[PDB]
């Protein structure tokens, strides 16, 4: 009805009014209803008029939003500001080839934006906001809220709807990746969030864009921290956690999916190999509180390491050097990890069949000085039965 603006103002006021409340009762009773209403509003029912009966929802827009600016003043609309009408927003948005024509159009657009900015600064024209979201917002609390999985699903749907324009999707994926850090905190209840991210990361181009942000290092650091926490826990007590391994398996799967990009593999395969090897070793060490999810994560890590362990001769040399360094990291008294380490090393040096050019890898080992580390480890052997 015509009370669309007023009802929406009341609803948004209520939603933002108690969004920060963390009590389960309030979240269940008030937040869920407001979220459902907003979800119904954002995604309209499918078109019924025969003319647009199959037309896309985004297509029927009568206007086109600013490419990199949000002209809405949410605080003003909440304050029922006279200048914050929905009609005002409509008036502010634009309606919905020769090379020289294109150049003239681009120059005109740039000049018009500059003139509008100058009129805003000097005169009374309002200032549209810029596409930059904060790291702390209602979305972060709402998405990983442990109160109800239905609320998480609704929030995921709302967020997925919120990302339509590619320019919007940029900052959207940025904020989503930023929020990824809390994955360990809510290992199970955040399953929806992962589902959203994987859903949004389906675009290969978007995958490369995220890769350019250097997300791989953050993922590796998080994986290392999780592995360390798990090892400490397994070494500490004998309690049983039915949810042990969910976060680790999810992170491993996400890392593998990102690594599936062949160009990305060609880009930074070497940079990540060491983390993979250390994790595989640590997982092989895990023996006390071993979970089926942990086992699957270990298998995935081993497969990823093996796949990464296939490249140029220089790549093989780098892998050998990494193995030597990791063995240097391994303790001398330890008598388990070096087994697998040297086993893979030998398999690589002379390819195990299923003048010593096939042993040229050994020269690489001498270049790395690994032979000295080998002698040192040989010195470490003391008990024949034990080793």
């Amino acid at each position: 009805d015509s009370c669309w603006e007023l009802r929406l103002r009341c609803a948004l006021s209520l939603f933002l009014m108690a969004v920060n409340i963390k009590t389960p009762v309030v979240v269940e009773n008030i937040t869920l209803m407001c979220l459902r209403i907003l979800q119904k509003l954002i995604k309209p029912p499918a078109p019924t008029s025969k003319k647009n009966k199959d037309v896309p929802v985004e297509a029927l827009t009568t206007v086109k939003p600013y490419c990199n600016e949000i002209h809405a003043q949410a605080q003003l609309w909440l304050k029922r500001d006279p200048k914050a009408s929905y009609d005002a927003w409509k008036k502010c948005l634009p309606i919905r080839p020769s090379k020289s024509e294109l150049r003239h159009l681009y120059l005109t657009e740039k000049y018009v934006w500059r003139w509008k900015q100058f009129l805003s600064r000097r005169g009374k024209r309002t200032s549209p906001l810029d596409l930059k979201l904060g790291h702390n917002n209602w979305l972060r609390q709402v998405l990983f809220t442990p109160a109800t999985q239905a609320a998480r699903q609704a929030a995921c749907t709302i967020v997925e709807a919120l990302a339509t324009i590619p320019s919007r999707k940029q900052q959207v994926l940025d904020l989503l990746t930023s929020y990824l850090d809390e994955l360990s905190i809510a290992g199970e209840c955040a399953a929806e969030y992962l589902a959203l991210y994987q859903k949004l990361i389906t675009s290969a181009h978007w995958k490369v864009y995220l890769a350019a942000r250097g997300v791989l290092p953050y993922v590796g650091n998080l994986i290392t921290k999780e592995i360390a926490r798990l090892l400490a826990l397994e070494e500490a007590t004998l309690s049983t956690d039915l949810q042990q391994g969910y976060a680790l398996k999810s992170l491993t799967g996400l890392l593998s999916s990102f690594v599936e990009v062949e160009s990305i593999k060609r880009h930074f395969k070497s940079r990540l190999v060491g983390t993979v090897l250390n994790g595989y070793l640590c997982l092989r060490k895990l023996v006390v509180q071993r979970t089926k999810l942990i086992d699957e994560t270990q298998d995935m890590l081993l497969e990823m390491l093996e796949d990464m362990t296939t490249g140029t001769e220089s790549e093989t040399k780098a892998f050998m050097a990494v193995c030597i360094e990791t063995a240097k990291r391994y303790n001398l008294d330890d008598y388990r990890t070096p087994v697998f380490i040297f086993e893979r090393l030998c398999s690589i040096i002379y390819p195990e069949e299923n003048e010593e050019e096939v042993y040229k890898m050994a020269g690489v080992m001498a270049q790395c000085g690994g032979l000295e580390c080998m002698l040192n480890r040989l010195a470490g052997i003391r008990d024949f039965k034990q080793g």
Binding site: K64, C67, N68, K91, P94, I95, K99, L102, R103, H104, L105, Y106, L107, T108, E109, K110, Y111, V112, R114, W115, F118, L119, R122, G123, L131, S167, Q170, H205, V208, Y209, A211, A212, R213, E262, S263, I264, R266, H267
Partner: protein
């Protein structure tokens, strides 16, 4: 320094070791936020379907006065040296943005005679 980052990005976006289809995405990845019209114009400028690393470097160089004068000339559609307010309205209509005639008058007023000289346009920029 910047050249190294550009080369690294070009290598990363290079699927087979780049197509113009993701060229705008490459600029978005580099931290630059482009407009669709700007991207289309750059594509027209460059692809006289794949660009070279020197080509992307040259494009980014044009991204990092003559343009201002060309824009001023475009503003004087009649070329009378005076950019007509009605000409401004025609341009805005071409841009598809809807604005009040009173809004155009106020903008011109914010721009002695209220007639935008080339000096007036330069001072605006």
């Amino acid at each position: 320094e910047q050249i190294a980052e550009f080369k690294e990005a070009f290598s990363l976006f290079d699927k087979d070791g780049i197509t113009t289809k993701e060229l705008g995405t490459v600029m978005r990845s580099l931290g630059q936020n482009p407009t669709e019209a700007e991207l289309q114009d750059m594509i027209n400028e460059v692809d006289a379907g794949t660009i070279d690393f020197p080509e992307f470097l040259t494009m980014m160089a044009r991204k990092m006065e003559e343009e201002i004068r060309e824009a001023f000339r475009v503003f004087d559609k009649d070329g009378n040296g005076y950019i007509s307010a009605a000409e401004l309205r025609h341009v805005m209509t071409n841009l598809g943005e809807k604005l009040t005639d009173e809004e155009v008058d106020e903008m011109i007023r914010e721009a002695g005679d209220g007639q935008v000289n080339y000096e007036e346009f330069v001072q605006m920029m």
